[PDB]
Amino acid sequence: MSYADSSRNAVLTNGGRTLRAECRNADGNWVTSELDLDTIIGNNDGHFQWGGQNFTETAEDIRFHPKEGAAEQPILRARLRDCNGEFHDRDVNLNRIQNVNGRLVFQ
């Protein structure tokens, strides 16, 4: 279960830092919500880290597939710099992000 189950039209903005969606609220209205991903996802030795910060700082080829695959998962993908300064392609499923009454939150 993620925000995606009750949201639509999810994209990244601000150069891949910002998750922006329309989230169905308590009454079933569709309201705009944005979540700064740099506040909740870090780069830990070239891996995405929930509860980290600033993953975009040197990340390259940031992209987002809101409905990736037959499982339709919200997948963020990026090349991330490891402790040795080498980059590797990485992915993280955004199901730690939830829609709470129309707002995108991190749980």
Ligand X SMILES: OC[C@H]1O[C@@](CO)(O[C@H]2O[C@H](CO)[C@@H](O)[C@H](O)[C@H]2O)[C@@H](O)[C@@H]1O
Distance separating alpha carbons of residues 25 and 78, to the nearest angstrom: 30
Q: Which is nearer to ligand X, 4 or 64 (CB)?
A: 4
Q: Count the neighbouring beta carbons within 10 Å of the beta carbon of residue 20.
A: 15
> Is there binding between residue 96 and ligand X (CB under 6 A)?
no
Give least dist CB 89 to ligand X, A.
14
Among 13, 34, 58, 89, binds ligand X (CB under 6 A): 58
Q: Count the neighbouring beta carbons within 10 Å of the beta carbon of residue 7.
A: 23
The residue type of 47 is H
Sole residue written with tokens 């339709």:
72
> Is there binding between residue 60 and ligand X (CB under 6 A)?
no
> Is there binding between residue 83 and ligand X (CB under 6 A)?
yes
> Is there binding between residue 101 and ligand X (CB under 6 A)?
yes
Tokens describing residue 36: 């700064």
Q: Site mask, ligand X, residues 16-55, x = CB under 6 A?
A: --------xxx---------------xxxxx-----xxxx
The residue type of 62 is I
Distance separating alpha carbons of residues 4 and 10, to the nearest angstrom: 8
Q: Which residues contact ligand X by CB under 6 A?
A: 1-3, 5-6, 24-26, 42-46, 52-55, 57-58, 81-83, 98-102
